């Protein structure tokens, strides 16, 4: 029992973190095989960031201007190229610690772990979700760029995120490992609007299922509702619409607890309409939406 | 910016996790040098746990009855001994992945990361605190015993906790790496009372400092208070008494924000007396007490 915001063990990713310096800018790189991946804004000076022309800035850079250091050892850069918003620096040495890996572009509402890094050294690991507005509520300071988000399936690391930016509002923006930003964000120091941050309904419900499994059942009522009735309430409270796919995905949680998905929907409807009345659910005084049904199942079954 | 419950990177500890089987019981072990540390209740059958006599149960066990498996390789057990509530199994091979390490007994209110494991394989990592009642609010399932809690100082892992038990209330009890339980708990399947779980006041204040640093400043008022006036309010709300040592420890946070510790105390006093009024602080609708002043400083400075 117990429910915590749990991250994947970071060992496989720690073995991939390197430092990338270009000019006066230092950030993190991801070394997999003989390629180091990093945000392309490593080639920018703080003056360039207002309106960078990355192709022109990159023309002035050669392989020897990219300093890549793995631990205390310097890697030799034999090639460099830009793929969307990431640079791929080909090095002469394959990372001996390269785990089995994939690059995946995740959907909003999906969760992943971040290994926050500074100067190629890992400082911490935390779990977060890709928000419906394509931002992440991370914890990143100066030099954290290049830090990655990932999931692990037994021994295969699916890298899904690379940190690039912090918006004026303190939320974070980044790309997948092919350099495509999640959202409408661009790697420019300009006024960028995040958009409405809605609540991931299927995740709140999965967390209500974990709460029931964990003995916290005060919020369960004698009511049911329909997908349409529920979604009328969900829209008013800036919650994502619940679809039949979400209901299907909650099936194992519904089967384990014996609580039909629509019955749990009615409990959530009353929690939204009446608030928590000073009470807590799983030690929280608000509805948590950064646990997918896969995360709840995993944390309540023991998958290593 | 951003504030998250951040754990230490778990790589150094993942390299130490092994599986320990004795009879029909399998749990996790910590392999450091040529010794595997594990809960002594690995020698108990589910019938023995009502009132085990560990010395007598241990007499019936020989080195060959302890199956230790590191990955898919079996380790040879050449010695076994009991130290308080832990078994120390001497193996013929030193762990090649042994990091620099120490064994430390932590104080209540101190935080640490847990690498939750099952069958010697790491499944997740999360951050928690040793509660003032010497329990931990973990997330552990069947087979999680032997999972460890640690802190990292650059390259030195200080192991502080080994998981042993789940109380009937769902909170967790365990020992330091010398086998001494934190609290009055005993490794027996018996009715054990946890005690009053008070709030770690110095940690709530450190988190209020992180909130101010992170732009969440609504709760700051025009008032101050005294250590004695504050503690009168703290006692009523089951908060730990704040001492001059706690005030000293908050010094760097007070210096960085320009807010005197007693002024922050008055803000917390009003938050306790009036509640949050439906508002949030760092994305939470309750006062968080599992971030020490060292954690807040570390997460707001970038220590790797
Ligand atoms: O290192 C950071 C940084 C990242 C972060 O998440 N939090 C911080 C908090 C305090 C100070 C700095 C940071 N930078 C430099 C690059 N950078 C940027 C600026 C413009 C465009 C692009 Cl793609 C990137 C940033 O956003 C800011
Ligand atoms: O593996 C677990 C377990 C640990 C846990 O933290 N959560 C669980 C949730 C569901 C089912 C089992 C568990 N056990 C076996 C040993 N055990 C025990 C019993 C008596 C004494 C001693 Cl020292 C230990 C337990 O408390 C329970």
XYZ file of C-alpha atoms and ligand atoms in Angstrom:
662
model
C 0.000 0.000 0.000
C 0.816 3.709 -0.321
C 0.814 5.880 -3.420
C 3.644 8.128 -4.470
C 4.693 10.114 -7.533
C 7.184 7.460 -8.636
C 9.816 7.864 -11.292
C 11.569 5.079 -13.237
C 15.033 4.104 -11.941
C 17.406 6.554 -13.736
C 20.537 4.432 -14.019
C 20.192 3.678 -17.737
C 19.843 7.404 -18.537
C 22.569 8.561 -16.121
C 24.991 6.470 -18.209
C 24.007 8.576 -21.276
C 24.420 12.096 -19.873
C 27.247 14.262 -21.225
C 28.156 17.958 -21.186
C 28.036 19.938 -24.430
C 29.803 23.314 -24.656
C 29.756 25.576 -27.692
C 31.395 28.928 -27.235
C 30.313 30.244 -23.856
C 27.126 28.076 -23.650
C 27.156 24.777 -21.757
C 24.176 22.411 -21.570
C 23.482 18.638 -21.396
C 23.665 16.115 -24.193
C 22.302 12.576 -24.570
C 24.992 10.175 -25.791
C 23.501 7.067 -27.474
C 25.714 4.954 -29.745
C 28.143 7.405 -31.515
C 25.707 10.385 -31.508
C 25.255 13.146 -28.876
C 21.820 14.837 -29.014
C 21.365 18.321 -27.603
C 19.257 21.516 -28.004
C 20.426 23.506 -31.013
C 20.310 26.724 -28.936
C 23.743 25.592 -27.579
C 25.156 27.523 -30.622
C 23.480 30.780 -29.543
C 24.991 33.537 -27.515
C 22.540 35.262 -25.091
C 22.231 38.108 -27.682
C 21.296 35.645 -30.514
C 18.275 34.252 -28.624
C 15.958 37.219 -29.453
C 15.673 36.065 -33.102
C 18.210 33.365 -33.973
C 18.712 32.163 -37.545
C 20.001 28.713 -36.594
C 21.124 27.825 -40.107
C 23.314 30.961 -40.296
C 24.645 30.536 -36.728
C 25.425 26.888 -37.441
C 27.443 27.797 -40.622
C 29.955 29.595 -38.390
C 30.424 26.391 -36.292
C 32.747 23.483 -37.027
C 33.056 20.045 -35.338
C 35.928 21.303 -33.114
C 33.741 24.130 -31.666
C 31.518 21.452 -29.998
C 33.149 20.372 -26.771
C 31.619 17.122 -25.564
C 32.742 15.762 -22.202
C 31.511 12.409 -20.774
C 32.564 12.318 -17.120
C 36.084 13.725 -17.154
C 36.852 12.445 -20.703
C 36.619 14.498 -23.867
C 34.843 12.917 -26.865
C 36.093 13.591 -30.396
C 33.375 15.214 -32.617
C 33.638 13.937 -36.198
C 30.304 15.255 -37.523
C 27.507 17.704 -36.774
C 24.030 18.241 -38.130
C 20.775 19.933 -37.238
C 17.483 17.975 -37.069
C 14.643 20.385 -36.359
C 15.567 21.936 -32.903
C 18.254 19.408 -31.931
C 21.878 19.062 -32.897
C 23.295 15.627 -33.484
C 27.009 15.542 -32.865
C 28.655 12.442 -34.239
C 31.478 11.350 -31.960
C 34.253 8.810 -32.732
C 33.293 6.581 -29.764
C 30.093 4.631 -29.199
C 28.751 5.033 -25.619
C 29.621 1.753 -23.890
C 26.684 2.384 -21.523
C 24.082 2.738 -24.314
C 20.973 0.903 -23.123
C 18.281 -0.543 -25.453
C 16.384 2.576 -26.575
C 13.678 4.086 -28.768
C 12.654 7.668 -29.551
C 8.943 8.229 -29.042
C 6.715 11.275 -29.387
C 4.219 11.087 -26.531
C 0.591 12.191 -26.381
C -0.611 14.912 -23.964
C -1.747 13.327 -20.703
C 1.069 10.739 -20.854
C 3.601 10.658 -18.046
C 7.392 10.222 -17.992
C 10.404 10.634 -15.728
C 12.910 13.471 -16.013
C 16.556 13.138 -15.078
C 17.360 16.817 -14.337
C 21.021 17.416 -15.186
C 23.593 20.262 -14.955
C 26.982 20.157 -16.766
C 26.308 16.556 -17.889
C 25.857 15.412 -14.287
C 22.507 14.105 -13.028
C 21.112 15.963 -10.022
C 17.640 14.496 -9.583
C 14.793 12.481 -10.946
C 11.079 13.266 -10.891
C 7.867 12.210 -12.545
C 5.743 14.545 -14.619
C 3.144 14.585 -17.405
C 2.886 16.173 -20.797
C 0.094 18.712 -20.122
C -2.792 19.083 -22.608
C -1.246 22.510 -23.488
C 2.046 20.685 -24.379
C 4.039 22.220 -21.531
C 5.554 20.365 -18.582
C 5.492 21.514 -14.983
C 9.111 20.620 -14.361
C 11.797 21.784 -12.004
C 14.650 23.159 -14.062
C 17.320 25.829 -13.404
C 20.075 27.448 -15.548
C 22.076 24.817 -17.409
C 19.312 22.172 -17.260
C 18.735 22.295 -21.038
C 19.350 18.949 -22.711
C 17.932 17.060 -19.657
C 15.661 14.238 -20.909
C 12.312 12.663 -20.195
C 11.884 8.936 -20.630
C 9.882 5.809 -19.868
C 11.320 2.296 -19.331
C 9.755 -0.994 -20.509
C 11.754 -3.732 -18.712
C 15.171 -2.908 -20.303
C 14.197 -0.531 -23.172
C 14.382 3.243 -22.524
C 11.890 5.221 -24.617
C 13.204 8.749 -24.693
C 10.292 11.114 -25.212
C 11.432 14.582 -24.152
C 14.441 16.897 -24.249
C 14.316 20.094 -22.217
C 14.836 23.311 -24.160
C 13.048 26.217 -22.550
C 11.330 27.894 -19.619
C 8.391 30.125 -20.526
C 7.886 33.529 -18.782
C 5.210 31.748 -16.685
C 7.666 29.199 -15.228
C 6.308 26.192 -17.137
C 8.663 24.250 -19.396
C 8.786 23.561 -23.132
C 10.813 21.018 -25.054
C 11.064 18.641 -27.953
C 10.943 14.922 -28.692
C 14.387 13.348 -29.604
C 13.860 14.229 -33.288
C 13.829 17.953 -32.286
C 10.159 18.700 -32.813
C 8.714 20.828 -30.027
C 5.687 19.610 -28.154
C 3.208 22.440 -28.716
C 3.511 25.671 -30.687
C 6.725 26.693 -28.953
C 9.798 27.853 -30.828
C 13.373 28.061 -29.497
C 13.376 31.826 -29.326
C 13.505 34.172 -26.300
C 10.160 35.684 -27.162
C 6.754 36.103 -25.495
C 5.149 32.667 -25.909
C 1.628 31.808 -24.707
C 1.189 28.366 -23.144
C -2.597 28.087 -23.544
C -5.304 26.729 -21.198
C -3.949 23.994 -18.973
C -6.843 21.560 -18.709
C -7.036 18.598 -16.243
C -6.350 15.077 -17.566
C -9.698 13.455 -16.652
C -8.730 9.814 -17.387
C -5.681 10.344 -15.045
C -7.751 11.856 -12.205
C -10.044 8.783 -12.466
C -7.090 6.393 -12.465
C -5.840 8.152 -9.300
C -9.366 7.799 -7.733
C -9.102 4.063 -8.528
C -5.636 3.948 -6.756
C -7.168 5.822 -3.804
C -9.958 3.220 -3.533
C -7.409 0.378 -3.811
C -5.410 2.112 -1.023
C -8.356 2.357 1.393
C -9.251 6.051 0.843
C -12.940 5.648 -0.054
C -14.765 8.612 1.613
C -15.525 10.266 -1.727
C -17.408 7.264 -3.145
C -21.110 7.990 -3.397
C -24.357 6.135 -4.255
C -24.597 7.782 -7.707
C -23.836 7.024 -11.295
C -23.813 9.275 -14.409
C -23.461 9.072 -18.233
C -20.433 10.025 -20.402
C -22.438 13.037 -21.751
C -23.710 14.166 -18.291
C -20.186 13.819 -16.859
C -18.576 15.761 -19.765
C -21.005 18.667 -19.228
C -19.535 18.965 -15.682
C -15.985 18.257 -16.935
C -16.154 21.100 -19.533
C -17.228 23.612 -16.839
C -14.240 22.662 -14.650
C -11.656 22.734 -17.508
C -11.310 18.937 -17.476
C -10.537 17.044 -20.709
C -13.543 15.277 -22.249
C -13.753 11.607 -21.297
C -14.161 9.273 -24.312
C -15.056 5.548 -24.636
C -11.282 4.894 -25.204
C -10.601 6.385 -21.745
C -13.384 4.216 -20.236
C -11.857 1.116 -21.929
C -8.377 2.053 -20.637
C -9.803 2.248 -17.061
C -11.279 -1.290 -17.483
C -8.621 -3.158 -15.466
C -8.947 -0.590 -12.619
C -12.760 -0.909 -12.760
C -12.458 -4.748 -12.692
C -10.017 -4.771 -9.760
C -12.117 -2.420 -7.595
C -15.573 -3.574 -8.671
C -16.503 0.077 -9.327
C -17.932 0.831 -12.776
C -16.161 3.686 -14.613
C -19.371 5.771 -14.776
C -19.892 5.337 -11.001
C -16.371 6.714 -10.403
C -17.229 9.535 -12.857
C -20.215 10.470 -10.604
C -17.970 10.570 -7.545
C -15.573 12.906 -9.428
C -18.555 15.030 -10.581
C -19.576 15.530 -6.895
C -15.935 16.218 -5.892
C -15.803 18.947 -8.583
C -19.199 20.405 -7.617
C -18.739 20.274 -3.840
C -14.972 20.377 -3.317
C -13.059 18.210 -0.821
C -14.604 19.910 2.297
C -11.142 20.104 3.885
C -10.537 16.363 3.384
C -7.650 14.617 1.532
C -7.369 11.738 -0.976
C -4.042 9.865 -0.983
C -2.566 12.660 1.167
C -3.559 15.379 -1.298
C -6.150 18.170 -0.922
C -6.661 18.465 -4.718
C -7.415 16.025 -7.544
C -4.140 14.590 -8.966
C -3.871 14.189 -12.769
C -0.245 13.086 -13.328
C -0.829 9.305 -12.967
C -2.049 7.471 -16.057
C -4.113 4.245 -15.722
C -0.886 2.401 -16.754
C 0.985 4.113 -13.870
C -1.710 3.268 -11.321
C -1.784 -0.386 -12.463
C 2.062 -0.581 -12.458
C 2.340 0.967 -8.941
C -0.450 -1.264 -7.613
C 0.874 -4.525 -9.259
C 4.659 -4.310 -8.811
C 6.104 -4.268 -12.354
C 9.936 -3.980 -12.246
C 11.832 27.553 -11.718
C 9.328 24.872 -10.685
C 9.310 22.713 -7.576
C 8.938 18.968 -7.565
C 9.352 16.092 -5.119
C 12.765 15.151 -6.508
C 14.662 11.989 -5.763
C 18.422 11.417 -6.145
C 19.491 9.632 -9.354
C 19.233 5.893 -8.452
C 21.968 4.444 -10.645
C 24.486 3.874 -7.845
C 21.892 1.941 -5.802
C 20.460 -0.003 -8.764
C 23.947 -1.510 -9.170
C 23.676 -2.852 -5.573
C 20.264 -4.546 -5.710
C 20.120 -8.347 -5.491
C 17.458 -10.975 -4.790
C 17.635 -12.989 -1.570
C 15.618 -16.213 -1.239
C 15.480 -18.363 1.875
C 13.073 -21.247 1.742
C 9.882 -19.961 0.167
C 10.546 -16.258 1.026
C 12.117 -13.933 -1.543
C 13.008 -10.295 -0.848
C 15.677 -7.724 -1.855
C 19.238 -7.481 -0.639
C 21.829 -4.690 -0.780
C 25.165 -5.959 -2.103
C 28.092 -3.726 -1.026
C 31.636 -5.117 -1.184
C 31.381 -8.892 -0.333
C 28.325 -8.527 1.979
C 24.587 -8.738 1.115
C 22.333 -6.964 3.654
C 18.692 -7.954 3.973
C 15.785 -8.095 6.490
C 16.200 -11.050 8.830
C 12.505 -11.947 8.362
C 13.655 -13.606 5.071
C 14.207 -16.734 7.284
C 10.570 -16.756 8.448
C 7.737 -18.707 6.977
C 4.346 -16.875 7.020
C 3.430 -18.976 10.127
C 6.638 -17.896 12.000
C 5.823 -14.168 11.730
C 3.268 -14.168 14.615
C 6.080 -14.553 17.197
C 9.417 -15.430 15.588
C 12.455 -16.383 17.666
C 15.025 -15.283 15.087
C 17.964 -16.869 16.885
C 16.239 -20.287 16.878
C 15.016 -19.929 13.264
C 18.501 -18.876 12.177
C 20.108 -21.993 13.829
C 18.209 -24.165 11.337
C 19.721 -22.167 8.404
C 23.085 -22.721 6.739
C 24.957 -20.612 4.129
C 23.593 -22.788 1.268
C 19.943 -22.062 2.284
C 20.493 -18.364 1.322
C 20.058 -18.012 -2.410
C 21.510 -14.715 -3.584
C 21.074 -13.774 -7.236
C 22.573 -10.584 -8.777
C 20.961 -10.152 -12.195
C 20.898 -13.664 -13.621
C 24.062 -14.779 -11.731
C 24.104 -16.715 -8.487
C 26.464 -15.490 -5.735
C 28.222 -17.996 -3.473
C 27.366 -17.442 0.256
C 30.398 -18.171 2.447
C 29.112 -16.677 5.721
C 25.964 -15.505 7.481
C 25.268 -13.501 10.599
C 22.504 -11.528 12.247
C 22.992 -7.863 13.262
C 19.883 -6.651 15.062
C 17.050 -7.039 12.413
C 19.290 -7.511 9.361
C 21.144 -10.501 8.014
C 24.578 -10.020 6.554
C 25.388 -12.690 4.025
C 29.055 -12.824 3.158
C 29.493 -13.718 -0.497
C 32.718 -14.832 -2.259
C 32.574 -11.931 -4.761
C 32.868 -8.210 -4.098
C 30.210 -6.177 -5.990
C 32.100 -4.578 -8.884
C 29.459 -1.812 -8.897
C 29.944 -0.876 -5.212
C 29.832 2.919 -5.044
C 31.454 5.017 -2.263
C 29.060 4.510 0.670
C 28.281 5.123 4.335
C 25.593 3.801 6.684
C 23.794 6.595 8.501
C 20.938 6.645 10.991
C 18.802 9.652 10.090
C 16.796 11.979 12.318
C 12.989 12.309 12.016
C 12.127 15.109 9.598
C 15.065 14.194 7.320
C 14.336 13.178 3.752
C 15.753 10.442 1.499
C 15.073 8.611 -1.748
C 13.727 5.067 -1.954
C 14.541 2.685 -4.771
C 11.478 0.380 -4.559
C 12.537 -3.092 -5.702
C 10.922 -6.520 -6.337
C 12.979 -9.732 -6.824
C 16.225 -7.698 -6.787
C 15.031 -5.551 -9.695
C 14.397 -1.818 -9.272
C 10.891 -0.692 -10.209
C 10.795 2.948 -9.142
C 12.292 5.784 -7.210
C 10.563 8.313 -4.968
C 11.360 10.840 -2.294
C 10.036 10.605 1.235
C 10.766 11.703 4.810
C 11.290 9.953 8.089
C 8.114 11.048 9.934
C 8.336 12.300 13.544
C 6.571 9.005 14.517
C 9.450 7.073 12.803
C 7.272 5.650 10.033
C 7.565 6.405 6.321
C 4.682 7.049 3.965
C 6.099 4.876 1.217
C 4.682 2.939 -1.676
C 5.553 -0.703 -1.189
C 3.873 -3.976 -2.265
C 4.571 -7.698 -1.578
C 8.237 -8.516 -2.109
C 9.430 -4.916 -1.595
C 11.224 -5.780 1.670
C 14.946 -5.075 1.512
C 14.354 -1.961 -0.693
C 16.594 0.880 0.571
C 16.467 4.571 1.324
C 19.510 6.705 0.656
C 20.970 10.162 0.122
C 23.858 11.041 -2.241
C 26.631 13.595 -1.573
C 28.387 14.048 -4.954
C 29.602 10.404 -5.318
C 29.013 8.978 -1.789
C 25.746 7.080 -1.137
C 24.606 7.314 2.489
C 22.256 4.417 3.003
C 19.831 5.302 5.775
C 16.859 2.949 5.488
C 15.968 -0.655 4.690
C 12.310 -1.549 4.256
C 10.991 -4.280 6.535
C 7.309 -3.855 7.234
C 3.892 -2.405 6.470
C 1.776 -1.558 9.511
C -1.997 -2.357 9.572
C -2.519 1.371 8.825
C -0.594 1.252 5.519
C 2.415 3.255 6.732
C 5.859 1.665 6.543
C 8.473 0.688 9.124
C 12.110 -0.218 8.655
C 15.632 -0.139 9.962
C 18.923 1.650 9.363
C 21.661 -0.540 7.665
C 22.823 -1.807 11.082
C 19.339 -3.392 11.563
C 17.971 -1.071 14.216
C 14.358 -0.119 13.565
C 13.414 3.518 13.369
C 10.772 3.805 16.091
C 9.395 1.229 18.516
C 8.582 -1.256 15.768
C 9.587 -4.898 15.922
C 9.739 -7.376 13.018
C 6.686 -9.285 14.134
C 3.231 -9.605 12.512
C 1.537 -8.049 15.502
C -0.693 -5.036 16.213
C 1.767 -2.120 16.266
C 0.762 1.494 16.974
C 2.489 4.153 14.868
C 1.823 7.141 17.146
C 0.825 10.756 16.365
C 2.157 11.855 13.006
C 3.084 15.487 13.572
C 4.013 18.001 10.795
C 7.701 18.859 10.271
C 7.504 22.639 10.854
C 11.049 23.532 9.684
C 10.244 21.635 6.395
C 6.905 23.417 5.838
C 8.795 26.735 6.269
C 11.533 25.659 3.866
C 8.790 24.809 1.331
C 7.187 28.286 1.929
C 10.634 29.762 1.157
C 10.768 27.685 -2.134
C 7.240 28.892 -2.950
C 8.325 32.532 -2.502
C 11.454 31.917 -4.620
C 9.154 30.366 -7.281
C 6.787 33.357 -7.454
C 3.920 31.953 -5.317
C 3.652 34.765 -2.750
C -0.118 35.208 -2.056
C 0.181 33.835 1.480
C 2.765 36.410 2.602
C 1.254 38.859 5.054
C 2.234 42.093 6.869
C 2.750 40.278 10.204
C 5.524 38.884 12.301
C 5.457 36.659 15.432
C 7.803 35.220 18.117
C 9.118 31.623 18.454
C 6.901 31.182 21.584
C 3.757 32.741 19.988
C 4.276 30.627 16.850
C 4.802 27.384 18.854
C 1.516 27.957 20.729
C -0.222 27.823 17.297
C 2.052 24.985 16.091
C 1.183 22.775 19.128
C -2.574 23.203 18.473
C -2.149 22.075 14.843
C 0.105 19.058 15.660
C 3.173 20.776 14.186
C 6.649 20.081 15.626
C 8.001 22.855 17.864
C 10.307 25.249 16.028
C 13.667 25.786 17.796
C 16.512 28.324 17.298
C 18.435 25.509 15.461
C 15.575 25.344 12.922
C 15.648 29.163 12.557
C 19.453 29.017 11.999
C 19.025 26.222 9.419
C 16.507 28.427 7.508
C 19.090 31.292 7.463
C 20.233 30.845 3.841
C 16.567 30.708 2.679
C 15.784 33.825 4.760
C 18.853 35.612 3.268
C 17.984 34.677 -0.327
C 14.345 35.821 -0.070
C 14.832 38.783 2.260
C 12.048 37.394 4.483
C 12.919 36.980 8.167
C 12.191 33.489 9.565
C 9.706 34.872 12.132
C 7.838 36.760 9.364
C 7.455 33.473 7.443
C 6.325 31.863 10.735
C 3.492 34.471 10.939
C 2.399 33.669 7.393
C 2.287 29.941 8.311
C 0.377 30.796 11.529
C -2.322 32.562 9.413
C -2.349 29.674 6.885
C -2.990 27.254 9.791
C -5.652 29.485 11.381
C -7.473 30.445 8.180
C -6.742 27.603 5.758
C -5.841 28.057 2.074
C -9.327 29.420 1.079
C -9.337 27.123 -1.966
C -5.946 28.432 -3.150
C -2.723 26.457 -3.877
C 0.989 26.905 -3.055
C 3.434 25.263 -5.484
C 0.495 23.360 -7.017
C -0.589 21.904 -3.676
C -3.743 22.612 -1.626
C -2.055 21.600 1.672
C 1.184 22.527 3.449
C 4.041 20.227 2.284
C 6.508 18.964 4.932
C 8.736 16.502 3.021
C 11.341 19.052 1.806
C 14.112 19.941 4.242
C 15.865 23.357 4.038
C 18.817 21.439 2.462
C 16.444 20.032 -0.210
C 14.935 23.437 -0.985
C 18.408 25.021 -1.278
C 19.679 22.101 -3.442
C 16.626 22.243 -5.787
C 16.843 26.040 -6.030
C 20.690 26.152 -6.566
C 21.379 23.213 -8.903
C 23.698 20.879 -6.948
C 24.529 17.752 -9.024
O 19.238 27.483 -18.791
C 18.162 28.050 -18.948
C 17.060 27.819 -17.966
C 16.175 26.803 -18.191
C 15.091 26.511 -17.311
O 14.224 25.658 -17.546
N 15.013 27.281 -16.179
C 15.883 28.326 -15.874
C 15.735 29.053 -14.694
C 16.599 30.103 -14.422
C 17.585 30.451 -15.322
C 17.740 29.742 -16.502
C 16.915 28.651 -16.776
N 17.945 28.914 -19.954
C 18.870 29.201 -21.056
C 18.226 28.847 -22.394
N 16.828 29.315 -22.489
C 16.338 29.547 -23.805
C 15.991 30.832 -24.218
C 15.428 31.021 -25.471
C 15.205 29.941 -26.314
C 15.560 28.676 -25.885
Cl 15.220 27.306 -26.898
C 16.138 28.461 -24.652
C 16.010 29.447 -21.405
O 14.791 29.386 -21.469
C 16.683 29.639 -20.074
O 6.067 -8.134 1.387
C 5.393 -7.635 2.282
C 4.719 -6.322 2.050
C 5.382 -5.172 2.368
C 4.817 -3.875 2.185
O 5.363 -2.827 2.555
N 3.571 -3.840 1.611
C 2.838 -4.967 1.249
C 1.580 -4.839 0.662
C 0.857 -5.975 0.331
C 1.361 -7.230 0.602
C 2.607 -7.374 1.190
C 3.374 -6.247 1.489
N 5.199 -8.249 3.462
C 5.843 -9.492 3.901
C 6.663 -9.244 5.165
N 5.940 -8.421 6.156
C 6.332 -8.593 7.513
C 5.446 -9.127 8.446
C 5.816 -9.199 9.780
C 7.060 -8.741 10.193
C 7.924 -8.218 9.249
Cl 9.455 -7.573 9.760
C 7.589 -8.151 7.914
C 5.007 -7.487 5.810
O 4.735 -6.518 6.503
C 4.328 -7.675 4.482
